[PDB]
Amino acid sequence: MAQNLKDLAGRLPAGPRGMGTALKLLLGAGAVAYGVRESVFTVEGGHRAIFFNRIGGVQQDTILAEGLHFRIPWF
Amino acid sequence: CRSRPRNVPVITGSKDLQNVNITLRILFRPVASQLPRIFTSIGEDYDERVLPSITTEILKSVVARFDA
């Protein structure tokens, strides 16, 4: 299966310089959009989805009444 | 916020304590101004899961104070 991906990636036409940087920028934008989408969490109302601070445990003082609160991914 | 129907039978004891069976109407129109709360801390099935029990409680208490 790895060799098939090898051939598929290789077969991409050797286009002029512009589209290479274009593809790099597109990948950057895709990753950034994915991160922005993921920074919000499963949220039902009737659930004060509080900030679980990574350090020190739960945020005993950060009591999330009804309101945006972006979870730092992996944090 | 309609006054949806909620008929809630009750089987209590009167003051002279003959077994009294009373049903009641909960003509509940959730307060429009309080619906934020009526979904935060009351929820979607507000009536089905709030009103029947309070009806039973109140009706039994009232019946306890009058003979058959």
From Swiss-Prot, chain A:
Tissue and organ distribution: Expressed in myoblasts.
Region (Necessary for transcriptional repression): 19-49
Protein localization: Mitochondrion inner membrane; Cytoplasm; Nucleus; Cell membrane
N-acetylalanine modification, residue list: 2
PTM section of the record: Phosphorylated. Tyrosine phosphorylation is indirectly stimulated by IGFBP6.
Subunit field text: The mitochondrial prohibitin complex consists of two subunits (PHB1 and PHB2), assembled into a membrane-associated ring-shaped supercomplex of approximately 1 mDa. Interacts with ESR1, HDAC1 and HDAC5. Interacts with ZNF703. Interacts with STOML2. Interacts with ARFGEF3. Interacts with SPHK2. Interacts with COX4I1; the interaction associates PHB2 with COX. Interacts with MAP1LC3B (membrane-bound form LC3-II); the interaction is direct and upon mitochondrial depolarization and proteasome-dependent outer membrane rupture. Interacts with IGFBP6 (via C-terminal domain). Interacts with CLPB.
Name of this chain's protein: Prohibitin-2
Gene name as annotated: PHB2
Curated annotation (Swiss-Prot), chain B:
UniProt modified residues of type N6-acetyllysine: 60
Modification Phosphothreonine, positions: 23
Reported effect, residue 37 to H: In a breast cancer sample; somatic mutation
Protein name per Swiss-Prot or TrEMBL: Prohibitin 1
Tissue: Widely expressed in different tissues.
Family: Belongs to the prohibitin family.
Tree of life domain: Eukaryota
Induction of the gene: Expression increases approximately 3-fold upon entry into G1 phase compared with other phases of the cell cycle. Also induced following inhibition of mitochondrial protein synthesis by thiamphenicol.
Function in brief: Protein with pleiotropic attributes mediated in a cell-compartment- and tissue-specific manner, which include the plasma membrane-associated cell signaling functions, mitochondrial chaperone, and transcriptional co-regulator of transcription factors in the nucleus. Plays a role in adipose tissue and glucose homeostasis in a sex-specific manner. Contributes to pulmonary vascular remodeling by accelerating proliferation of pulmonary arterial smooth muscle cells. In the mitochondria, together with PHB2, forms large ring complexes (prohibitin complexes) in the inner mitochondrial membrane (IMM) and functions as a chaperone protein that stabilizes mitochondrial respiratory enzymes and maintains mitochondrial integrity in the IMM, which is required for mitochondrial morphogenesis, neuronal survival, and normal lifespan. The prohibitin complex, with DNAJC19, regulates cardiolipin remodeling and the protein turnover of OMA1 in a cardiolipin-binding manner. Regulates mitochondrial respiration activity playing a role in cellular aging.
Cellular location(s): Mitochondrion inner membrane; Nucleus; Cytoplasm; Cell membrane
Source lineage: Eukaryota, Metazoa, Chordata, Craniata, Vertebrata
Subunit structure: The mitochondrial prohibitin complex consists of two subunits (PHB1 and PHB2), assembled into a membrane-associated ring-shaped supercomplex of approximately 1 mDa. Interacts with STOML2. Interacts with MAP1LC3B (membrane-bound form LC3-II); the interaction requires PHB2 and takes place upon Parkin-mediated mitochondrial damage. Interacts with STAT3 (unphosphorylated or phosphorylated at 'Ser-727'). Interacts with CLPB. Interacts with CD86 (via cytoplasmic domain); the interactions increases after priming with CD40.
